[PDB]
Amino acid sequence: DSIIHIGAIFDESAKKDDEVFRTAVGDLNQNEEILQTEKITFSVTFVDGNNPFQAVQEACELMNQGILALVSSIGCTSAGSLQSLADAMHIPHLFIQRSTAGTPRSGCGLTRSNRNDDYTLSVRPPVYLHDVILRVVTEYAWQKFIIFYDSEYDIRGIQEFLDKVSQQGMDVALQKVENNINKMITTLFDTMRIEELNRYRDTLRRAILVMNPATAKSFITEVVETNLVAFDCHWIIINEEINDVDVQELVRRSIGRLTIIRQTFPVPQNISQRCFRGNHRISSTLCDPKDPFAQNMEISNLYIYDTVLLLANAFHKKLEDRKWHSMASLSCIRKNSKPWQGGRSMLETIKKGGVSGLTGELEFGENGGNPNVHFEILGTGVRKLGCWNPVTGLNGSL
Amino acid sequence: DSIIHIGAIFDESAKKDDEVFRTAVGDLNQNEEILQTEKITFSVTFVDGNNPFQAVQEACELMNQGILALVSSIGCTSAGSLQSLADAMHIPHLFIQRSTAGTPRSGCGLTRSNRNDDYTLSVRPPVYLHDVILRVVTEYAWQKFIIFYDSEYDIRGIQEFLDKVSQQGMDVALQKVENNINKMITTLFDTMRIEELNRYRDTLRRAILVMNPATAKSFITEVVETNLVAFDCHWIIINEEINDVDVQELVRRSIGRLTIIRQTFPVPQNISQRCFRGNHRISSTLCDPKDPFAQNMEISNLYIYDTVLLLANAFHKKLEDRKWHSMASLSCIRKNSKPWQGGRSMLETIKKGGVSGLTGELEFGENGGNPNVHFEILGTGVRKLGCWNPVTGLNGSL
Ligand SMILES: [Ca+2]
Ligand SMILES: [Ca+2]
Ligand SMILES: [Ca+2]
Ligand SMILES: [Ca+2]
């Protein structure tokens, strides 16, 4: 007989989030130290992330079943709708932002209504891309460069960076890179001429790529092959999510200098402590860095695992404190729709929770967002040049 | 006994849209030539435009009452949710995009799901700001300038413009203007010095303001007073919505050259034909340019009027063709929620409609959007320098 039931809404592209979600629940149900006498059960629904009404409808159906919390892994398009639904129903909403096609994340810029209590906790850290890239270009004493971004990137994400470089009098070009690079560059040679080409080549000597790894790979290869860059060029690629396979391929395809900036996770070193966090045992497929799955995990997958860990500890604490409120079957858009009476106290318990997991430490600040993040800085073989985090800033000279 | 009932959802800031909506219905119900034996009735609801679940909920309640079409005047935050609801319920959705606080419009960038038929018709024309401003800077042979934007503007709206000026090798600075200008500029003098000040003054010799009129007025006054600009400066202000009072105040507060770019509406000249479109008589408060109300109308107000005119003609045609489908009471998020069976044919009738109204001609292209728009270009007293539209382009040399 289950009294612990959670709901999950996933974008159709988030099959790996669903896999890790289910594995996390499995791991916790094997853990005798957390929720000693209660199993966690769940209901999952996949939706078209670009259909906010579908998102709301299917979230509402989960709330009718009865849930303690709603986990979502979805993009910005439906995020606002789910956040506002959660606010109306007092269902704690653990929101894991997914980027589109591996493009670098930008804030959802949601301007969600602040009249009502906010039932959404943002599991992924704030987007710090603009801060990190400013620090790195400053260290390299750049004065003139071009920013290339892919067709999915939201340039509001660099608006602060653009303001700052302008204030400092720099010569910064923007350019969207079409999903089809060959046409873009082929068109370029046909239309331009020697004096113009030399100018473009000069512009390409310093660039920043704000794009998904696949497009960057293709983009680098095409300019290298067409000799638009040479051994003196220096490109910076920045994206929270670039895996080791991507890094090696980027280095392999590029000539000259490459700097790679990606998110990193501060997890224990010892083999023993790798698949353990205290007495919680993690399935080897997620924590062993020799496992093929673990190496192929998306960043959102790591946050989903830790989210389930955090929820389980919150439910445990609520039971231990003898302040349990039973789940309720809710209804959306009905004459007597009413919020979950247990919601406010559950939200507060979750909000002050903290766990050690696959991402490092997951916790929430007063603004309802995870504050913890670390970036590593690689440089061309390839080696680790430094680290960045929003607290201590840049460590290790570049 | 009414068989013609429409619904409207308005942002809390859209009281004038509601007023003009009601006046339009009144005007049509007085018109014996359109809907000769049927009165139009309606239900209006105001919502927090930043609360997409509230928007959906209240739209759903209107659909439960029974409506032939849904008119909305709202910002991008809830637009996606209402569009996807309309798609699910097959309710024709006449969407009038409102900008926040008079900031220049940018596309909602909605990436709304295209698997399903699109029941939304976009009443306002596409955002052409980026096209117009490119043409004007080219005519002035600008090579170096700064773009100032207000705190609400979505810079994705100029991403194409930024790409183009980069391609042409221009030196273009960006800067957000905080809602509080004095602090921004006061901070500036305290921190900077003669060599830096001369450089900033030089940067301010050519600027584009992408902001609401109120902030522009304040911004111009503060730089003029602090002598950061002089008689040789040349600023361009661009916004669909700048009324005559705003224009005069802008000119009055500015020194040097000012170019103002705003939307204009090609309506008849003759006094008689001003408050008439064929045999349809328009209330004098909306069409007489000597009336105080008409002079204070927002752009969205004009589109709301024409939208009601267009819907009435569509209903008329549907009746005349003997293809009427009665409204139905629909339910959202229920076990047997079903779309309106009359929706597909009503959508198609509306989509191919066209009326002469307060905006000029309102009609829809194959993409479901109004294609018609005209910009006028004013220049400093003040006079009309030229016109722009996406068909014939720029007319009258600047
Ligand atoms: Ca369902
Ligand atoms: Ca910040
Ligand atoms: Ca209501
Ligand atoms: Ca275009």
Side-chain angles (χ1 to χ4, degrees), chain A residues 1-268 270-398, chain B residues 1-268 270-398:
Chain A
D1 192 276
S2 180
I3 59 164
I4 305 173
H5 196 73
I6 55 173
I9 294 281
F10 297 132
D11 180 79
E12 289 170 354
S13 82
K15 290 284 174 186
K16 277 181 165 182
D17 291 331
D18 174 61
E19 290 170 0
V20 173
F21 180 77
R22 290 169 181 268
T23 299
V25 171
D27 288 358
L28 275 163
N29 284 342
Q30 289 299 305
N31 183 332
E32 292 197 3
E33 193 210 295
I34 302 167
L35 290 172
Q36 307 174 70
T37 72
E38 299 291 353
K39 292 292 200 64
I40 301 155
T41 55
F42 56 82
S43 298
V44 174
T45 301
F46 287 94
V47 298
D48 180 351
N50 292 137
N51 191 330
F53 181 65
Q54 183 189 33
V56 164
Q57 179 184 297
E58 293 302 329
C60 284
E61 289 183 27
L62 296 177
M63 292 172 185
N64 182 264
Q65 168 65 43
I67 59 177
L68 296 167
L70 179 71
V71 178
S72 69
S73 193
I74 197 150
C76 293
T77 301
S78 289
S81 295
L82 291 178
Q83 289 180 33
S84 55
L85 169 66
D87 293 352
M89 303 308 305
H90 298 193
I91 294 289
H93 174 214
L94 283 283
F95 168 52
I96 295 74
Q97 187 188 349
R98 285 180 61 87
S99 63
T100 300
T103 194
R105 278 202 307 144
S106 297
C108 285
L110 210 72
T111 179
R112 164 221 149 268
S113 194
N114 63 328
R115 312 178 189 173
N116 322 117
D117 293 353
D118 191 348
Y119 273 80
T120 302
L121 302 169
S122 296
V123 173
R124 287 182 77 165
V127 179
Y128 278 111
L129 187 152
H130 60 284
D131 287 328
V132 183
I133 192 63
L134 178 59
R135 177 59 61 186
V136 174
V137 298
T138 296
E139 285 279 315
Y140 287 141
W142 284 16
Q143 300 293 327
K144 173 187 167 58
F145 52 94
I146 183 168
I147 299 161
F148 292 117
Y149 56 98
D150 69 26
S151 59
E152 297 292 346
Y153 181 67
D154 172 7
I155 63 160
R156 290 178 297 181
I158 52 167
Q159 86 182 27
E160 192 178 316
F161 178 55
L162 294 175
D163 270 26
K164 292 297 187 64
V165 298
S166 299
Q167 287 175 51
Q168 290 169 17
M170 302 183 180
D171 184 19
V172 177
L174 254 69
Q175 185 184 326
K176 188 174 67 168
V177 173
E178 280 72 38
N179 195 22
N180 181 30
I181 291 81
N182 274 43
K183 179 67 175 186
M184 191 180 74
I185 289 172
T186 300
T187 304
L188 200 70
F189 274 81
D190 301 340
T191 57
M192 291 180 64
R193 117 162 184 228
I194 175 59
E195 276 191 32
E196 311 181 44
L197 229 70
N198 277 14
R199 277 195 281 276
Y200 193 67
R201 282 195 188 88
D202 176 69
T203 291
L204 299 200
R205 279 167 170 153
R206 302 236 197 278
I208 307 173
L209 311 191
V210 182
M211 51 188 73
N212 70 98
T215 296
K217 288 168 190 180
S218 165
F219 183 59
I220 289 163
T221 290
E222 196 60 25
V223 301
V224 163
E225 283 184 354
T226 56
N227 294 285
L228 291 168
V229 293
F231 180 75
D232 69 311
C233 79
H234 181 185
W235 283 16
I236 302 172
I237 305 177
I238 180 165
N239 192 327
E240 280 168 323
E241 187 152 22
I242 314 171
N243 58 36
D244 294 342
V245 175
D246 287 332
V247 169
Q248 292 303 321
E249 186 66 8
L250 289 168
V251 173
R252 191 192 69 72
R253 286 162 176 253
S254 65
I255 58 178
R257 195 172 182 174
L258 186 61
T259 304
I260 298 172
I261 305 167
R262 64 175 187 176
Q263 188 181 6
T264 194
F265 302 98
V267 286
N270 197 283
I271 175 56
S272 311
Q273 315 313 320
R274 262 289 162 92
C275 297
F276 292 80
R277 299 292 186 284
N279 301 326
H280 179 75
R281 191 183 204 179
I282 303 169
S283 282
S284 55
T285 58
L286 316 177
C287 58
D288 184 18
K290 297 174 297 308
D291 193 285
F293 189 102
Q295 293 174 346
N296 285 332
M297 288 182 79
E298 313 172 280
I299 286 184
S300 63
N301 305 161
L302 303 184
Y303 282 101
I304 290 284
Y305 191 94
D306 289 3
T307 293
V308 175
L309 187 55
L310 192 144
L311 285 174
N313 278 276
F315 301 151
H316 178 95
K317 175 169 176 49
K318 192 148 255 287
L319 286 166
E320 197 172 12
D321 294 347
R322 294 165 286 269
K323 293 183 176 191
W324 194 254
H325 291 262
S326 293
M327 309 173 291
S329 163
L330 310 176
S331 304
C332 300
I333 315 188
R334 305 290 212 103
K335 187 170 177 174
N336 292 281
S337 296
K338 287 178 182 306
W340 182 34
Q341 301 303 297
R344 181 58 181 172
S345 62
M346 181 63 76
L347 176 69
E348 287 303 316
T349 299
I350 296 160
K351 189 171 178 190
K352 72 198 198 78
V355 297
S356 311
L358 296 173
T359 65
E361 297 293 310
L362 173 58
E363 66 196 300
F364 305 102
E366 184 62 18
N367 68 344
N370 176 9
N372 302 319
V373 63
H374 298 79
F375 284 88
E376 71 174 352
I377 305 163
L378 311 175
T380 56
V382 62
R383 62 189 190 85
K384 186 188 178 197
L385 300 175
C387 293
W388 188 96
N389 73 81
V391 186
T392 64
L394 179 61
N395 291 328
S397 180
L398 301 181
Chain B
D1 192 276
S2 180
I3 59 164
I4 305 173
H5 196 73
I6 55 173
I9 294 281
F10 297 132
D11 180 79
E12 289 170 354
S13 82
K15 290 284 174 186
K16 277 181 165 182
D17 291 331
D18 174 61
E19 290 170 0
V20 173
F21 180 77
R22 290 169 181 268
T23 299
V25 171
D27 288 358
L28 275 163
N29 284 342
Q30 289 299 305
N31 183 332
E32 292 197 3
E33 193 210 295
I34 302 167
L35 290 172
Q36 307 174 70
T37 72
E38 299 291 353
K39 292 292 200 64
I40 301 155
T41 55
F42 56 82
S43 298
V44 174
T45 301
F46 287 94
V47 298
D48 180 351
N50 292 137
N51 191 330
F53 181 65
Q54 183 189 33
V56 164
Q57 179 184 297
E58 293 302 329
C60 284
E61 289 183 27
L62 296 177
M63 292 172 185
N64 182 264
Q65 168 65 43
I67 59 177
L68 296 167
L70 179 71
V71 178
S72 69
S73 193
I74 197 150
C76 293
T77 301
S78 289
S81 295
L82 291 178
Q83 289 180 33
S84 55
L85 169 66
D87 293 352
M89 303 308 305
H90 298 193
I91 294 289
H93 174 214
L94 283 283
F95 168 52
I96 295 74
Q97 187 188 349
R98 285 180 61 87
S99 63
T100 300
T103 194
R105 278 202 307 144
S106 297
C108 285
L110 210 72
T111 179
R112 164 221 149 268
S113 194
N114 63 328
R115 312 178 189 173
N116 322 117
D117 293 353
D118 191 348
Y119 273 80
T120 302
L121 302 169
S122 296
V123 173
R124 287 182 77 165
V127 179
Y128 278 111
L129 187 152
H130 60 284
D131 287 328
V132 183
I133 192 63
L134 178 59
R135 177 59 61 186
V136 174
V137 298
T138 296
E139 285 279 315
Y140 287 141
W142 284 16
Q143 300 293 327
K144 173 187 167 58
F145 52 94
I146 183 168
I147 299 161
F148 292 117
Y149 56 98
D150 69 26
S151 59
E152 297 292 346
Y153 181 67
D154 172 7
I155 63 160
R156 290 178 297 181
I158 52 167
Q159 86 182 27
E160 192 178 316
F161 178 55
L162 294 175
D163 270 26
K164 292 297 187 64
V165 298
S166 299
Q167 287 175 51
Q168 290 169 17
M170 302 183 180
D171 184 19
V172 177
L174 254 69
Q175 185 184 326
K176 188 174 67 168
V177 173
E178 280 72 38
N179 195 22
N180 181 30
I181 291 81
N182 274 43
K183 179 67 175 186
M184 191 180 74
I185 289 172
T186 300
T187 304
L188 200 70
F189 274 81
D190 301 340
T191 57
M192 291 180 64
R193 117 162 184 228
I194 175 59
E195 276 191 32
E196 311 181 44
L197 229 70
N198 277 14
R199 277 195 281 276
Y200 193 67
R201 282 195 188 88
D202 176 69
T203 291
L204 299 200
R205 279 167 170 153
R206 302 236 197 278
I208 307 173
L209 311 191
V210 182
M211 51 188 73
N212 70 98
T215 296
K217 288 168 190 180
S218 165
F219 183 59
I220 289 163
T221 290
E222 196 60 25
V223 301
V224 163
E225 283 184 354
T226 56
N227 294 285
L228 291 168
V229 293
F231 180 75
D232 69 311
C233 79
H234 181 185
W235 283 16
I236 302 172
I237 305 177
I238 180 165
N239 192 327
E240 280 168 323
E241 187 152 22
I242 314 171
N243 58 36
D244 294 342
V245 175
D246 287 332
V247 169
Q248 292 303 321
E249 186 66 8
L250 289 168
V251 173
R252 191 192 69 72
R253 286 162 176 253
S254 65
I255 58 178
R257 195 172 182 174
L258 186 61
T259 304
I260 298 172
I261 305 167
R262 64 175 187 176
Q263 188 181 6
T264 194
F265 302 98
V267 286
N270 197 283
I271 175 56
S272 311
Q273 315 313 320
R274 262 289 162 92
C275 297
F276 292 80
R277 299 292 186 284
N279 301 326
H280 179 75
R281 191 183 204 179
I282 303 169
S283 282
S284 55
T285 58
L286 316 177
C287 58
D288 184 18
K290 297 174 297 308
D291 193 285
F293 189 102
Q295 293 174 346
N296 285 332
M297 288 182 79
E298 313 172 280
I299 286 184
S300 63
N301 305 161
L302 303 184
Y303 282 101
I304 290 284
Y305 191 94
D306 289 3
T307 293
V308 175
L309 187 55
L310 192 144
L311 285 174
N313 278 276
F315 301 151
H316 178 95
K317 175 169 176 49
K318 192 148 255 287
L319 286 166
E320 197 172 12
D321 294 347
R322 294 165 286 269
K323 293 183 176 191
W324 194 254
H325 291 262
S326 293
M327 309 173 291
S329 163
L330 310 176
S331 304
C332 300
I333 315 188
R334 305 290 212 103
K335 187 170 177 174
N336 292 281
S337 296
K338 287 178 182 306
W340 182 34
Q341 301 303 297
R344 181 58 181 172
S345 62
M346 181 63 76
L347 176 69
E348 287 303 316
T349 299
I350 296 160
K351 189 171 178 190
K352 72 198 198 78
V355 297
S356 311
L358 296 173
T359 65
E361 297 293 310
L362 173 58
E363 66 196 300
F364 305 102
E366 184 62 18
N367 68 344
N370 176 9
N372 302 319
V373 63
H374 298 79
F375 284 88
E376 71 174 352
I377 305 163
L378 311 175
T380 56
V382 62
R383 62 189 190 85
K384 186 188 178 197
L385 300 175
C387 293
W388 188 96
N389 73 81
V391 186
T392 64
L394 179 61
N395 291 328
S397 180
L398 301 181

